[PDB]
Amino acid sequence: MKDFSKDFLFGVATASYQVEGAYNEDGRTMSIWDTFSRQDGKVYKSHNGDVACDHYHLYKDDVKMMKDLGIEAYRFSIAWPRIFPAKGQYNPKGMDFYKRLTDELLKNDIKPFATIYHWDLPQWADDLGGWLNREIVEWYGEYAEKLFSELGGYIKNWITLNEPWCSSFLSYFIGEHAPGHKDLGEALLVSHNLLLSHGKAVEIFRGLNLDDSKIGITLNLNEVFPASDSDDDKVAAQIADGFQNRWFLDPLFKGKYPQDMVEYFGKYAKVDFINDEDLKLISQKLDFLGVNYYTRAVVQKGNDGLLDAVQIDPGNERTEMGWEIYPESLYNILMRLKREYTYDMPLYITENGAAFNDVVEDDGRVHDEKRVEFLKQHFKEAKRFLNDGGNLKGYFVWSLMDNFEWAHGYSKRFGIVYVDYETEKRILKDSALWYKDLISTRTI
Ligand code: NA
Ligand code: NA
Ligand code: NA
């Protein structure tokens, strides 16, 4: 038979600010990441997405490239600052790009998966308070409703948010991502307003009753292991698991924030944003969950401070991010969802991939054998989940091409396609050739 059914979606994924470029064209105004990347010290060597992969201009070549690989689905994000470059000011020229992009995908037999928000909040919105201002629920709802109305004939699979853990804790508490605040209370409120905005889009979506159309959300999830069997490390792992995973899984799928984290965070900051009405909106039924999976964490107790778990190095192989290559946690997380949160609901892997030190050799090829092996090991775990009864509908490799990796700039290469940024040349890596074979044979 086939390890992956004909209906299973082999995909690749990008995000608008990471690949598009054309940052000041056809009416687009600045996002918080345009601004953040221009603040000294925030992004590697002051890299920014002014040009990136120039995918805005090269999209026809990139779709042809995906068609020749046999790609069956393409996950991309839509740039809010192209669609509403000012508050309440719709930009048809911005919408026209996503119409010609998705028209090209459909005409080449690629199913579009559109992420509504992938971190490029318009600067006008942040200047009004951004995700800290509860009014953003209405601004986001107006944006999402415009996308549903204008693109409903083009796009049948919608993702409200990408990785709200990053938009909240990494952007407002740790401060690595835009807008770069460092305040736990702000990050917690932002996490709530993000989830409430997701809920508003779902409410609007259900009222539209679009034929054969599905909506979900994308979460980055890990698996946390205690470094030892001690009670100290067990509590440390519990907190780390609540911080990364349950803080978002529980309100979405149980209608309640995890109470151990509410009490834990409450010792350090306000948690008075929680109320029954908001959690009802947050926990509306979805059609699927998107899982972004990369690695696990091994943690031991720290200094009894705020979220101070010591990161243990188990001594295994890692990517250029320093992320352990541990494919078994892909299966473990999908199974955990099946047994604790999503049950029989369809799942997609909406991101999985790896950054390695890619070089174009004298033969003009990129022999990224570590990425070939990485993807092989993780797709084998996807196959094992399917054969054990898991409801996995597709798998999107991060990324189609090397791109702007946020605070790391262009220094981390995640693509199955190499980009020579000086010429914008695309070079298929060996991992892309391996993926092409996997799609064609559906065998691993
Ligand atoms: Na860009
Ligand atoms: Na810059
Ligand atoms: Na749901």
Automatic annotation (TrEMBL):
Keywords, alphabetical: Carbohydrate metabolism, Cellulose degradation, Glycosidase, Hydrolase, Polysaccharide degradation
Active site annotation, chain numbering: E163 (proton donor), E351 (nucleophile)
Gene3D superfamilies, per database record: Glycosidases
Keyword Metal-binding: no
Source organism superkingdom: Bacteria
Top enzyme category: hydrolase
Spans through the membrane: none
Gene Ontology CC terms: cytosol
PROSITE patterns: GLYCOSYL_HYDROL_F1_1 (PS00572), GLYCOSYL_HYDROL_F1_2 (PS00653)
Sites where the protein binds substrate: Q18, H118, N162, Y294, W398, E405, W406
Gene Ontology MF, one: beta-glucosidase activity
The keyword Lipid biosynthesis is assigned to this record: no
Family from the record: Belongs to the glycosyl hydrolase 1 family.
Entries under PANTHER family matching the protein: GLYCOSYL HYDROLASE, LP05116P
Name the UniProt record assigns to this protein: beta-glucosidase
